[PDB]
Design a protein around this ligand. Sequence first.
Ligand SMILES: *[C@@H]1O[C@H](CO)[C@@H](O[C@@H]2O[C@H](CO)[C@@H](O)[C@H](O)[C@H]2NC(C)=O)[C@H](O)[C@H]1NC(C)=O
Ligand SMILES: C[C@@H]1O[C@H](n2ccc(=O)[nH]c2=O)[C@@H](O)[C@@H]1O
Ligand SMILES: *[C@@H]1O[C@H](CO)[C@@H](O)[C@H](O)[C@H]1NC(C)=O
Length: 238
Amino acid sequence: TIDTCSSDSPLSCQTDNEASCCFNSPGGSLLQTQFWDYDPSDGPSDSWTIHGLWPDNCDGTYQEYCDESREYSNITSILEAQNRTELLSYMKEYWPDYEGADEDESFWEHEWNKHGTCINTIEPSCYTDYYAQEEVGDFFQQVVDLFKTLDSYTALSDAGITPSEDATYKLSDIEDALAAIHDGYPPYVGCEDGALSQLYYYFNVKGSAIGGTYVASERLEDSNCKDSGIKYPPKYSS
Ligand SMILES: *[C@@H]1O[C@H](CO)[C@@H](O[C@@H]2O[C@H](CO)[C@@H](O)[C@H](O)[C@H]2NC(C)=O)[C@H](O)[C@H]1NC(C)=O
Ligand SMILES: C[C@@H]1O[C@H](n2ccc(=O)[nH]c2=O)[C@@H](O)[C@@H]1O
Ligand SMILES: *[C@@H]1O[C@H](CO)[C@@H](O)[C@H](O)[C@H]1NC(C)=O
């Protein structure tokens, strides 16, 4: 399986070290990104959903589509072949394409191909007893594992911020509520049409992106929302 690195491995971006299987570089800022899909709605009425996991450069720029030889058009089959049946079921629920279940495959392809291929510590050469596309399944598992720790809906709810047809919200309140589950670092908060829409939680990593220690880090982009009047539209509203 993937190589293990010491739990006291040096932190990506925050240290000056050479890229290896145990050091994420140049993609040392890892973004766990989420959606609030209300029109059309997907996922549970009381949960955000997964967008992805993205390696950014430490300056906020990023690479994309970093290895054509490891781009796939069969994610669902790769997961099935690896017996990751609970993961695939979970992805259907919590990593949906808003347009419908039949577009999930294209979306998962997109995320792996664009961004997974750019995580340097995921490459087959970082495995013992590597098997074909092992790192693809591990990536989907890792995104899910990190997402589970970042329950945006509940963090917002606990701070009195819940979806509403009438209520509107202040950016700083949203930011503080979410900063509370991310070591006091707020995510990027993204709005669409004045509605709460996207979240990017930034991390630096000790060790490998698979199984390493994800340390909550400062956002390299703040928000495109207005300071107030923010709508949090209810899912499945009618
Ligand atoms: C998913 O698609 C990939 C890419 O085509 C498949 O991997 C290739 O499999 C072919 C046919 O067995 C081999 O000849 C190639 O060498 C493989 N390419 C690589 C880069 O590994 C893969 O087998 C497919 N997986 C599933 C479960 O269908
Ligand atoms: C990131 C971009 O947003 C679109 N997008 C957004 C949400 C979603 O649930 N599915 C989806 O496909 C994609 O077409 C693309 O991956
Ligand atoms: C999945 O299970 C099949 C059948 O038992 C087996 O051939 C294969 O090695 C398994 N793959 C993984 C990665 O568990």
